[PDB]
């Protein structure tokens, strides 16, 4: 299970987007016993929060998930080759760290509830 | 306190028939707070009804009561021989005068 | 026509009972090495807390059936217990005490309260012993025998063993906020005239309750919240005399309390690492502890309370205030602790008024060191003496009263101060809070059909 | 995150069906430490039970989910405007509380396992 | 909830494939309090691991899930009637226990990430 | 042709070891303030429990490798330990005892069992002492010196310190049900002739085990379950003599036990909050404790056991019952506790029979107050005396036996009562239970293909 963990952290973003299962499988597992239980419970809560974020974006059971949210060049004006063939996910996260919540709020409530209401109203037809 | 009038002063019946003892509260606001106590001669009182209508644990079903507001009543369905005593109505700390059920 | 549609995240709730977790200021934790009511069992609070107004929502509240009060009781008692486990236990001090009167500089009121008592005590070495003297209060010592041998024993020693509070641990109530875990909400009644029961048309949801200071007191609620508009009278049943009446003031009454004696603290070694702190010698004159309240302020608040009581007992009823009929010292006097010293004030001056339908007061207070908290028999604590003169300012924000029964005449109603159970002291702050369970799954009819 | 929590509890059911993410994001987070750990673990178990109920209805990753279960007028004979434009979800839950398990058993086993077997047998074609 | 639990453990595999919800609903719930908390937390972690395995196979919210992985006769050369009308799931698990990880690795990484990349590249068109 | 299809929720399981949680009646918890075997660590039970018959399922059981028995052992010992932590520790009582015979009203059998013993004792005040007398049993006191000074010491005092059971805590075994957490199941063998090992063709799954009373006893299983059809003989290896044989009766033998002495309880203060309860004075005549069993019922059950033993040791073998070869008092006698008093009965009358291939019995019992439970050296407890005459009724539902080895002649087999380890007492109730892990993920071939 642990084999290959984080091994594409120095690879390009595209090369590292082909090992997502390796890092997804490694996210789940006296006074010492309660400290370790608190660590395990926090890991569980953290996994559940991430999966809830995926589920409120229409991205459940998906390691790669496309959306209807346009990319803003204000967030990043780099070209596709620069990002996917000339950058790592760590550098990317450093670059977009101050824009993450804007994207997460454009995915959270606008796109998904709009799309979901439209599917309900199309299912009416 | 709350005045309680428990009429009639003396009620003369015979076994097996239904008696309807009544208590009327005067200086109250009106609620379901009443209790009915049975006191045989030479014995301390015993709780029959705890509430406007509910029954104390262990008391047979022949003893039943009802009421609300400022008028309540005890209904002994079957006047068995072990059912003749003095009956009292209680509204918080106040007590009734007492109703005698005597054989006749 | 219509089909089942499943909705997740619907704003539906039910009444529930959960285990709440506190929130406290990290700031005060840096200022407070330790406080009996631990900020370590609790969590640092979140700045800028959120309160969302639930417009158009009317919720049923019951101040008298609230599990937040019971959890607070359990938490405060347990925090006290664990704060007193590490500290020294004064079992070696259960010895015969030869006691004599202290008459160095004594006023006629303070005659006999303090006694000079000598006794044999253990030392750090197990093979040697020492004779040591300490001053003790009359309320903390009992005659061993009827005959006037002047031999005395500590009151607890027969029934139990008395722990000593650690000198470093502080007693100042710091605010604690009670927060709800995930999937639970705290609904706050924003109605200004609510009596703690019935529907509340103005409701809000809060992450945590406001800061509540665990103030332990009888006959008077100190350093609490205040009514926004009018004095608030809250009883489970006002007609019932067996239920205490909780009064909330809209304007506080300032109370100034003092023990004018200049006290000293004497370290006595009773073991290898165990110390016993004693009253030492009182520098200067000895005068009784007392509390001052403004007389005009007290009278105006009493008139306001009388008006609210008349709203429940008749417009021409006579509202009489009288003092405690009896009981333990805690309930008969206004018991409180401020600065680490435990006071016991005679409030006969406070409740000495008949109100017909139409300058300061000084309360003689007494001090104790053996304290039985929370109406428990067998778990006394020794309060170490506090060095210096203590001056103390507090707000009287409410009362705890009991109405006399068996009234032969119906034109008068007598109310006497009461207390002793702190569940009726902490329910005067949590009266407007109820915990609810969120039920986020809903099913409703729609015309939409799964393909 | 907490902003807007339960703020549509006095709004109509339709108006309150547009804030579901606000209430979905607020469902996940010594002797005192074990009491709080038990509270957190029960919150996790409760969220997992709700998500399992959604998943056995074909409603995973969905805040609004349509089904193939007809509404019975015995459950409620009210008209759509009454429910969605003239009632709150609290009143609705009060009305349907004694019918919830019937609906949940018509979603649990009939609709989903029937539909799922039919998708398997259509995937055979 | 507990009613019918494991009641198709002596039934044929097909007959037992119609009661999966009964066994899915029964997988979720001082020093004694921490021991029981550790048991409950391990049950939660175990359920989450199983659901993560389902989700990395494109099988989220699904009790029956078809895949694009051919069956190898080396794993089992039995005919469909033998398996589904003449065997129980316990005997099946005994037979395939030494082949489970091969199937799980053919579902884990090959099929799902291949399919998922192809859906992304088709969504590009 | 065929493709992988993933199935979740398949009825597949494997053998596993988990931490089970009890279930108990809330009712009895309201009736029982406290019981050594805590109903607080455990949970209220669910009315109308479910048992689903696993038709066509045959499961392998091993009575002799079951972790439910080990968990029960750990839980019962730990519950005892925590029930005895708060209670008083009788370290001040380790003093020289001047003991003399009690001959007020004594039968020839009870001669010397009880002794009148005087000793100096601590009082609540640390500076004063008292001389107090108590009656002690010969088994709880040991001569300090060989010379006849009549000086005595409590048996534990050299090696360990002896705790005192709290007088309020009760000793009555209440049933506890062992339940499995989520993702685990308890499989119950419903075969009526099962010997605890091998395949079980009739299996059911249960939420919780039946109520099992933690009855602590040696040589005889009391208040247990009974065989449905025939007497059941269960040994790990019947040929091996080092493994105890567990016998289950299909019909119980009623046993009536009594201590006819009218006992009293004397409170002695040994500390500020610590009390020591003593035997006081026995009102009236003193007679030995004893137990009665029906002789005809015992003989018929022994014949049934002999028949089952013949099914394992030959059809013409002589089955002889004899009494314990030796060991501690617990194993040599039928040890049990009923009412809070710990009995020790000589079962030589019970096992006094030779069975060739073709009115009541009275057992003289003895009483003790220093009890070393569960074969542990160093953790003795003092049982406070029980006031009044105790009468006691129990069902003998089984036996624990050991077969004698080294038999020179092969026509006879001798079986002697045994015990001491309660893992063989609690394994006679959990013999039909095994915990399993559910494996809900399955992969099977189908012709269906993902689009
Ligand atoms: C109601 O609220 C009022 C106002 O908050 C409160 O009075 C305050 O109490 C505190 C704590 O008793 C007082 O502070 C003490 O007084 C001085 C001022 O700094 C210091 O000498 C004290 O520090 C000593 O004690 C500490 C241990 O507690 C040690 O850590 C320290 O080293 C010192 O030895 C201490 O801070 C404060 O002065 C008053 N304020 C007023 C205006 O009276 C009152 O107690 C509350 N009432 C009740 C009943 O709870
Ligand atoms: C096998 O099962 C039998 C039947 O269940 C069991 O015998 C019963 O034991 C109980 C408990 O020892 C007996 O009840 C006691 O006896 C009387 C009857 O009410 C009371 O005096 C006792 O109460 C006193 O003690 C309590 C503390 O235990 C105090 O709380 C209380 O205030 C009293 O001081 C107590 O209830 C019961 O009478 C017998 N029943 C029969 C038919 O003998 C037996 O003990 C079990 N055997 C074994 C070996 O476990
Ligand atoms: C309490 O009595 C003690 C005697 O035990 C007093 O202590 C003595 O005080 C005198 C001064 O009058 C000193 O010379 C002695 O040395 C003290 N005794 C010892 C043993 O050192 C003490 O003054 C009294 N305290 C009060 C407050 O009256
Ligand atoms: C608090 O206010 C409520 C609402 O005014 C009071 O409830 C009324 O009184 C009784 C209960 O005592 C009930 O009949 C109803 O719930 C209310 N009646 C109405 C609105 O007609 C409640 O009594 C008040 N309590 C106090 C102590 O003042
Ligand atoms: C409480 O009130 C009393 C009575 O007014 C105050 O006692 C006076 O205090 C002042 C200031 O120290 C002295 O100059 C007076 O001589 C005192 N008057 C008396 C005893 O009649 C006392 O200070 C007040 N205590 C407080 C506010 O703690
Ligand atoms: C309580 O009030 C009574 C009067 O109702 C006080 O007693 C009177 O006090 C005044 C003023 O000191 C005296 O002139 C009277 O002679 C007192 N007796 C009577 C019968 O009026 C009493 O002092 C008050 N108690 C307090 C403040 O504790
Ligand atoms: C055990 O011996 C003690 C002596 O220590 C006896 O107690 C004395 O009994 C006599 C009556 O014979 C009383 O007058 C004395 O007061 C008792 N002694 C004390 C110190 O009070 C006791 O009777 C003996 N017990 C038995 C069972 O024989
Ligand atoms: C319990 O019954 C089983 C089944 O009858 C016995 O198992 C047989 O005996 C031995 C093990 O002792 C093994 O060869 C087989 O497992 C079984 N053999 C068969 C069916 O031919 C088991 O011995 C019995 N145990 C006791 C104590 O009677
Ligand atoms: C156990 O059996 C003995 C012997 O039968 C019983 O002792 C008899 O008890 C009765 C009733 O109290 C007495 O009248 C007899 O005198 C006793 N007979 C003797 C000593 O020979 C004893 O009661 C039984 N104990 C029980 C059932 O607890
Ligand atoms: C065990 O059995 C033996 C006999 O096998 C008993 O001893 C005999 O008891 C009878 C009846 O009391 C006497 O007549 C005999 O003289 C005894 N001796 C022999 C050699 O038979 C013995 O009492 C029994 N033991 C018990 C009940 O503990
Ligand atoms: C590291 O970078 C080199 C060239 O920059 C590349 O060939 C190699 O694959 C990279 N390795 C990893 C593990 O990213
Ligand atoms: C991109 O972000 C800017 C702010 O930096 C905002 O004004 C603009 O509207 C955004 N563009 C889109 C398409 O949302
Ligand atoms: C993102 O992070 C910092 C911190 O706010 C921000 O000031 C900065 O402009 C951003 N950095 C980059 C490299 O874009
Ligand atoms: C202290 O001990 C002495 C002898 O060391 C003794 O005479 C005196 O009475 C004791 N004092 C007490 C108990 O106060
Ligand atoms: C006392 O009341 C005043 C006036 O409301 C307030 O400002 C002050 O903070 C209060 N003090 C305490 C200690 O509660
Ligand atoms: C109390 O005594 C100390 C001891 O030095 C002194 O500094 C202080 O001024 C005294 N205070 C009063 C109010 O007398
Ligand atoms: C109450 O006041 C009376 C005088 O009216 C007094 O004698 C009595 O001691 C007071 N009681 C208490 C408990 O303070
Ligand atoms: C308080 O006002 C009331 C008015 O009835 C009356 O008892 C008295 O004049 C006032 N008392 C004081 C002490 O100011
Ligand atoms: C409350 O109701 C009023 C009218 O009934 C409506 O205008 C308003 O939007 C509602 N507000 C909420 C928060 O539901
Ligand atoms: C609606 O419920 C009733 C019972 O109230 C039942 O008889 C009827 O069949 C149900 N209708 C449908 C369409 O299932
Ligand atoms: C739903 O709940 C109660 C409780 O069973 C039931 O009797 C009643 O008919 C229902 N109430 C409504 C308002 O439909
Ligand atoms: C058990 O098997 C029989 C025949 O083998 C079959 O009729 C029956 O349905 C099966 N029962 C279960 C519960 O699997
Ligand atoms: C089946 O497994 C064998 C090894 O047993 C392997 O050689 C073969 O390639 C596999 N077949 C397929 C179609 O993957
Ligand atoms: C599967 O399990 C064992 C253990 O590795 C293996 O040797 C055996 O061949 C397999 N058993 C069956 C019945 O296929
Ligand atoms: C008890 O103490 C006395 C003196 O106080 C001593 O003579 C006697 O021997 C002691 N008794 C014992 C140890 O039994
Ligand atoms: C003893 O056995 C009888 C007959 O089986 C049974 O009814 C009774 O409950 C049993 N008593 C105990 C205490 O187990
Ligand atoms: C035991 O002694 C007590 C003490 O009064 C008495 O009430 C009771 O009757 C006695 N019992 C017997 C069996 O002698
Ligand atoms: C066993 O019985 C013999 C007589 O056969 C007896 O002497 C011996 O003491 C008994 N042993 C035990 C341990 O009871
Ligand atoms: C029991 O029966 C057997 C039959 O062999 C024999 O020992 C004896 O006659 C009987 N014993 C008693 C004590 O009834």
SS (H, E, C) chain C: CCEEEEEECCCCEEECCCCCEEEECHHHHHHCCCECCCCCCCCECCCCCCEEEECCCCEEEECCCCHHHHHHHHHHHHHHHHHHCCCCECCCCCCCEEEEECCCCECCCCCCCEEEEEEEEECCCCCCEEEEEEEEEHHHEEECCCCCCCEEEECCCCCCCCEECCCCCECCCCCEEEECCCCEEEEEECCCCCCCEEEECCEEEECECCCECCCCECCEEECCCCCCCCCEEECCCCCCCCCCEEEEEEEEEEEEEEEEEEECCEEEECCCCCEEEECCCCECCECCCEEEEEHHHHHHHHHHHHHHHHHHHCCCCEEEECCCCCCCHHHHCEEEEECCEEEEECCCCCCCEEECCCCEEEEEEEEECEECCCCCCCCCEECCCCCEEEEEEEEEEEEEEEECCCCCCCCEEEEEECCCCHHHCCCCCCCCEEEEEECCEEEEEECCCCC
Q: What's the gap in Å between F211 CA and the centre of ligand 26?
A: 14
F328 contacts F434 by C-beta, under 8 angstroms? no
Name the CA dihedral angle for A88, A92, A95, A100, rounded to a multiple of 10 degrees. -160
In chain B, after which residues is the C-to-N distance over 2.5 Å, breaking the chain?
A: none
Residue C277's DSSP bridge partners are C267
Give how far Cα E9 sits from Cα of D87, E15, F207, Å: 47, 10, 16
F125 touches chain E (CB under 8 A): no
Q: Could you say which DSSP state residue A125 is in? A: -
C399 contacts C220 by C-beta, under 8 angstroms? yes
B71 contacts B22 by C-beta, under 8 angstroms? yes
Question: For C223, left (φ over 0), alpha (ψ -120 to 50), or beta?
Answer: left
Cα–Cα dist F87/F163, whole Å: 7
Cα–Cα dist F365/F345, whole Å: 4
**Coil, helix or strand at residue A67:** coil
F443 contacts E102 by C-beta, under 8 angstroms? no
Best C11, C200, C441 member to test D by mutation, with max D CBs in 10 Å, is C11
Q: What share of chain F is helix, strand, coil (3-state, %, to 5)?
A: 10, 40, 50
Determine the residue of chain A that is closest to C8 in CA distance: A56
CA dihedral (C302, C308, C312, C313) positive or negative:
positive
Question: For E115, left (φ over 0), alpha (ψ -120 to 50), or beta?
Answer: alpha
Determine the residue of chain C that is closest to F124 in CA distance: C158
Which stretch of DSSP H or E encloses residue E24?
helix E20-24
For residue C407, report the phi and psi dihedrals to the nearest 5 degrees: -60, 120
User: What's the full length of chain E, in residues?
Assistant: 125
- Closest residue (by CA) to atom 11 of ligand 25? F119
F417 contacts F294 by C-beta, under 8 angstroms? no
Q: Could you say which DSSP state residue A70 is in? A: P
- Scanning the structure block, which residue is given the tokens 């009287």? C396
Task: Report the nearest atom of ligand 29 relative to the CA of F354.
Answer: 7
Q: Which of F197, D92, F246, F247 is nearest to C444 (CA)?
A: D92
Tell me how the structure was determined: cryo-EM
Q: Which chains form contacts with chain E, at 3 or more CB pairs under 8 Å?
A: A, D, F
Copy the structure tokens of residue C206.
């809060």
A123 touches chain C (CB under 8 A): yes
Cα B100 off chain centre by? 10
Cα–Cα dist B82/B38, whole Å: 11
Which stretch of DSSP H or E encloses residue B37?
strand B35-39
Cα–Cα dist C187/C59, whole Å: 8
Alpha helix ranges (H) inside A73-111: 80-85, 89-96, 100-105
Give how far Cα D58 sits from Cα of A28, D66, E67, E106, Å: 25, 9, 18, 26
- Scanning the structure block, which residue is given the tokens 């009388």? C306
Domain ranges of chain D: 6-122
Q: Could you say which DSSP state residue D109 is in? A: I
Q: What's the gap in Å between F311 CA and the centre of ligand 8?
A: 13
- Scanning the structure block, which residue is given the tokens 């925590």? F82
Q: Could you say which DSSP state residue F422 is in? A: G
Cα–Cα dist F272/B68, whole Å: 55
Q: Are F7 and E63 within 8 A, CB to CB?
A: yes
Cα–Cα dist C236/C224, whole Å: 20
Q: Helix E31-55 vs helix D31-55: angle between axes, to the nearest 10 degrees?
A: 30
A82 contacts A31 by C-beta, under 8 angstroms? no
- Closest residue (by CA) to atom 3 of ligand 27? F388
Decide the pairing of beta strands F381-382 and F163-164: parallel
Strand order in the sheet with C141-143: C129-137, C114-122, C97-101, C151-154, C141-143
**Coil, helix or strand at residue F60:** strand
- Scanning the structure block, which residue is given the tokens 């009656």? F135
Residue C199's DSSP bridge partners are C60
Q: Which residue among A52, A54, A60 places its CB closest to the CB of D28? A: A52
Q: Which residues contact F387 (CB under 8 A, 6 or more apart)?
A: F263, F264, F265
Q: Is the CB–ligand 15 distance for residue C395 below 6 Å?
A: yes
Copy the structure tokens of residue C70.
């019971």
Determine the residue of chain F that is closest to E111 in CA distance: F450
Which stretch of DSSP H or E encloses residue D120?
helix D112-123
Q: What's the gap in Å between A3 CA and the centre of ligand 11?
A: 18
Determine the residue of chain A that is closest to D65 in CA distance: A120
Task: Report the nearest atom of ligand 3 relative to the CA of C281.
Answer: 27
Name the CA dihedral angle for B10, B14, B19, B24, rounded to a multiple of 10 degrees. 0
Q: Helix D31-55 vs helix A31-55: angle between axes, to the nearest 10 degrees?
A: 30
Q: Which residues contact B56 (CB under 8 A, 6 or more apart)?
A: B47, B48, B49, B50
Copy the structure tokens of residue B52.
């406007």
User: What's the full length of chain D, in residues?
Assistant: 125
F404 contacts F241 by C-beta, under 8 angstroms? yes
Q: Which residues contact B59 (CB under 8 A, 6 or more apart)?
A: B47, B48
Q: Which residues of chain F does D124 touch, with a Cβ-Cβ cutoff of 8 Å?
A: 447-449
D114 touches chain E (CB under 8 A): no
Task: Report the nearest atom of ligand 25 relative to the CA of F97.
Answer: 14
Copy the structure tokens of residue F421.
């380890």
Q: Which of F337, F368, F110, F362 is nearest to F256 (CA)?
A: F362
A31 touches chain C (CB under 8 A): no
Q: Which residues of chain A does C449 touch, with a Cβ-Cβ cutoff of 8 Å?
A: 123-124
E87 touches chain F (CB under 8 A): no
Q: Which residues of chain F does C157 touch, with a Cβ-Cβ cutoff of 8 Å?
A: 124-125, 272
Q: Could you say which DSSP state residue F378 is in? A: S
CA dihedral (C441, C442, C448, C449) positive or negative:
positive
Cα–Cα dist C447/B27, whole Å: 59
Q: Say what the resolution is, in angstroms.
A: 2.8
The best mutation among E72, E75, E77, E99 to test binding of ligand 23, ranked by most ligand atoms within 8 Å of the C-beta, falls on: E72
Cα–Cα dist F141/F211, whole Å: 39
Strand order in the sheet with F370-371: F163-164, F381-382, F370-371
**Coil, helix or strand at residue F35:** strand
Cα–Cα dist E89/F7, whole Å: 10
């Amino acid at each position: 299970v642990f084999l290959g963990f984080l091994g594409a952290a120095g690879s390009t973003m595209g090369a590292a987007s082909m090992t997502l299962t390796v890092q997804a499988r490694n996210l789940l597992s006296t006074v010492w016993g309660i400290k370790q239980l608190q660590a395990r419970v926090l890991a569980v809560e953290r996994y559940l929060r991430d999966q809830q974020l995926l589920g409120i974006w229409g991205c459940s059971g998906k390691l790669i998930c496309c959306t209807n949210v346009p990319w803003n060049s204000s967030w990043s004006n780099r070209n596709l080759s620069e990002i996917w063939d000339n950058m790592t996910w760590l550098q990317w996260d450093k670059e977009i760290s101050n824009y993450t919540q804007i994207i997460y709020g454009l995915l959270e409530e606008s796109q998904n509830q709009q799309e979901k209401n439209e599917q309900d109203l199309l299912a009416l037809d | 306190v709350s005045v309680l009038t428990q009429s009639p002063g003396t009620l003369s019946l015979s076994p097996g028939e239904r008696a309807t003892l009544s208590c009327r509260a005067s200086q109250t606001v009106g609620s379901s707070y009443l209790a009915w106590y049975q006191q045989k001669p030479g014995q301390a009182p015993r709780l029959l009804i705890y509430g406007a209508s509910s029954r104390a644990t262990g008391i047979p079903d022949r003893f039943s009561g009802s009421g609300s507001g400022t008028d309540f009543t005890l209904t002994i369905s079957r006047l068995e021989p072990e059912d003749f005593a003095v009956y009292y109505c209680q509204q918080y700390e106040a007590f009734g005068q007492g109703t005698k059920v005597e054989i006749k | 026509n219509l089909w089942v549609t499943v909705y997740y995240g619907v704003p539906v709730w039910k009444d529930a009972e959960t285990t709440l977790f506190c929130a406290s200021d990290a700031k005060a934790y840096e200022t407070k090495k330790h406080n009996v009511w631990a900020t370590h069992a609790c969590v640092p609070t979140d700045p800028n807390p959120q309160e969302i107004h639930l417009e158009n929502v009317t919720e049923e509240f019951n101040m008298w059936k609230n599990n937040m009060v019971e959890q607070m009781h359990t938490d405060i008692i347990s925090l006290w217990d664990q704060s007193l486990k590490p500290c020294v236990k004064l079992t070696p001090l259960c010895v015969t005490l030869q006691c004599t009167n202290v008459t160095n500089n004594i006023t006629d009121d303070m005659r006999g309260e303090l006694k000079n008592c000598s006794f044999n005590m253990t030392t750090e070495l197990r093979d040697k012993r020492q004779k040591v003297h300490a001053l003790f209060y009359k309320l903390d010592i009992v005659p061993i025998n009827e005959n006037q041998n002047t031999s005395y024993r500590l009151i607890n020693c027969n029934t139990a063993a008395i722990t000593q509070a650690c000198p470093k641990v502080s007693f100042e109530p710091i605010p604690i906020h009670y927060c709800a875990p995930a999937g639970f909400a705290i609904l706050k009644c924003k109605d200004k005239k609510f009596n703690g029961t019935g529907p509340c048309p103005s409701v809000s949801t809060v992450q945590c309750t406001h800061g509540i200071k665990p103030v332990v007191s009888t006959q008077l609620l100190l350093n609490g919240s205040l009514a926004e508009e009018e004095v608030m009278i809250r009883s489970k049943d006002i007609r019932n005399n067996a239920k205490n009446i909780l009064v909330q003031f809209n304007t506080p009454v300032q109370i100034n309390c003092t023990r004018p004696n200049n006290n000293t603290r004497k370290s006595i070694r009773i073991g290898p690492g165990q110390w016993f702190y004693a009253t030492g010698d009182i520098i200067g004159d000895i005068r009784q502890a007392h509390c001052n309240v403004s007389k005009a302020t007290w009278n105006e608040t009493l008139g306001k309370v009388v008006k609210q009581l008349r709203k429940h007992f008749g417009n021409n009823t006579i509202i009489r205030f009288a003092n405690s009929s009896g009981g333990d010292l805690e309930v008969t006097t206004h018991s409180f602790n401020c600065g680490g010293e435990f006071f016991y004030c005679d409030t006969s001056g406070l409740f000495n008024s008949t109100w017909i339908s139409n300058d300061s007061i000084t309360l003689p207070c007494r001090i104790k060191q053996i304290i039985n908290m929370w109406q428990r028999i067998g778990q006394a604590m020794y309060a170490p003496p506090i060095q210096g003169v203590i001056r103390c300012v507090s707000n009287i924000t409410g009362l705890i009263l009991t109405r006399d029964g068996g009234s032969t005449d119906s034109t008068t109603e007598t109310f006497r101060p009461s207390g002793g159970d702190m569940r009726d002291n902490w329910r005067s702050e949590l009266y407007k809070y109820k915990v609810v369970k969120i039920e986020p799954l809903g099913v409703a009819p729609t015309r939409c059909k799964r393909r």
